[PDB]
Amino acid sequence: IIESDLERAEERAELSEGKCAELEEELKTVTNNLKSLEAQAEKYSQKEDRYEEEIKV
């Protein structure tokens, strides 16, 4: 019974670990996108200025 609950609890660990890994992969994907977007938001803010400068010029 404990083993059956263990198997299910382990299954939950696996399902939850599955989700953990999936979220981790999504976390990293999103975080990697965050980072590329941090780079883009800054490059874009810089472009906001390069373009603003093209307008000023």
Binding site: E25, T29, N32, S36
Partner: protein, 375 residues
């Protein structure tokens, strides 16, 4: 069981079949496109045991079965097995009778004609469906993604179709179709892992490698730098547990397989790769089309779930594209599950009620009607 004669939607590929009803958000059940058969002599008597197994039954009992896929490279070659898959799909898990519901099936635009014709015949003759429609995978992906214009790069298990669409219309002269797919990447991974001391040559072994691929493999953004490290250090290896307790680790092979999408020569294929064909699908369209296709590279199908693939596909085409112009990729969490989603959307459109073939016109014309009525 439904309160309307809603169409049934069955996204039947060379991998898994996703099925449910039109108007929903997701399939009710998914099934391997497999019919399994024992390769052993029975010894005990009164054990049940089928002559043939279908879908998930075939996969669950696979320890002694040889498993066959009725669909290869997007086309049904074995329609007796598809009748079994559809019987299972409809009556065992969705638990619906197509006799009371229209049914929508899917295929690539240059999928050989026998596919849509046999799909039409099975549903009208064995299921006696009141209506049929065979839909375009790119169309379905565009509805799911919220676009009417873009390149649909559908790199799934069967074929890569890669068709440019503008304002909802085909630009067929620019379809950069390619006989390179997820199934070849699986075959490559079986071979490259064999080289590591883990041979994978039987059906059970093939299903395990496909599972390994889906969880461990990636394409990355920069192959040469990724391999310079992966080939030099164990820090990039990842383990996988096999059903019998064996543990396999994969190093640079983890991405060298998937890389075949960008370097087809790895498996002996003569091809520019999926990113050059994506680029050419845009380039081969008229100059006043190109700007909208560059801004809308639509990713769908399988293999779209490899880490680094959306980022890499945009990098590879923007690198071939002209300067000044902005080139963008669309790669939503609905990638690959876009064909089924599009089926639900399309089946349910009021304007699509003029596209469905009824079990009237069918009898006068026969299954060849699909070539007069669908696309």
């Amino acid at each position: 069981d439904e309160d309307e004669t809603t169409a049934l939607v069955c996204d039947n590929g060379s991998g898994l079949v996703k099925a449910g009803f039109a108007g929903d958000d997701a399939p009710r059940a998914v099934f391997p496109s497999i019919v399994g058969r024992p390769r052993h002599q029975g010894v005990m008597v009164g054990m049940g045991q089928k002559d043939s197994y279908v879908g998930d039954e075939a996969q669950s009992k696979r320890g002694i079965l040889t498993l066959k896929y009725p669909i290869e490279h997007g086309i049904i070659t074995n329609w007796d097995d598809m009748e079994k898959i559809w019987h299972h799909t409809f009556y065992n898990e969705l638990r619906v009778a197509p006799e009371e519901h229209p049914t929508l099936l899917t295929e690539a635009p240059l999928n050989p004609k026998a596919n849509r014709e046999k799909m039409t015949q099975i549903m009208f003759e064995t299921f006696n469906v009141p209506a049929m429609y065979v839909a375009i995978q790119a169309v379905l992906s565009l509805y799911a993604s919220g676009r009417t214009t873009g390149i649909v790069l559908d790199s799934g298990d069967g074929v890569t179709h890669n068709v440019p669409i503008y304002e909802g219309y085909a630009l067929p002269h620019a379809i950069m179709r390619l006989d390179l797919a997820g199934r070849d990447l699986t075959d490559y991974l079986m071979k490259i892992l064999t080289e590591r001391g883990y041979s994978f040559v039987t059906t059970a072994e093939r299903e395990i490698v496909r599972d390994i691929k889906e969880k461990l493999c990636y394409v990355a953004l920069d192959f040469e730098n990724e391999m310079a490290t992966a080939a030099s250090s164990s820090s990039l290896e990842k383990s996988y547990e096999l059903p019998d307790g064996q543990v396999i680790t994969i190093g640079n092979e983890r991405f060298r397989c998937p890389e075949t999408l960008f370097q087809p020569s790895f498996i002996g294929m003569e091809s520019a790769g999926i990113h050059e064909t994506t680029y050419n699908s845009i380039m081969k369209c008229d100059i006043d089309i190109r700007k909208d296709l560059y801004a809308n590279n639509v990713m769908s199908g399988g293999t779209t779930m490899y880490p680094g693939i959306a980022d890499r596909m945009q990098k590879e085409i923007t690198a071939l594209a002209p300067s000044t112009m902005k080139i963008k990729i669309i790669a939503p969490p609905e990638r690959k599950y876009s064909v089924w989603i599009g089926g639900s959307i399309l089946a349910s459109l009021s304007t699509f009620q003029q596209m469905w073939i009824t079990k009237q016109e069918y009898d006068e014309a026969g299954p060849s009607i699909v070539h007069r009525k669908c696309f």
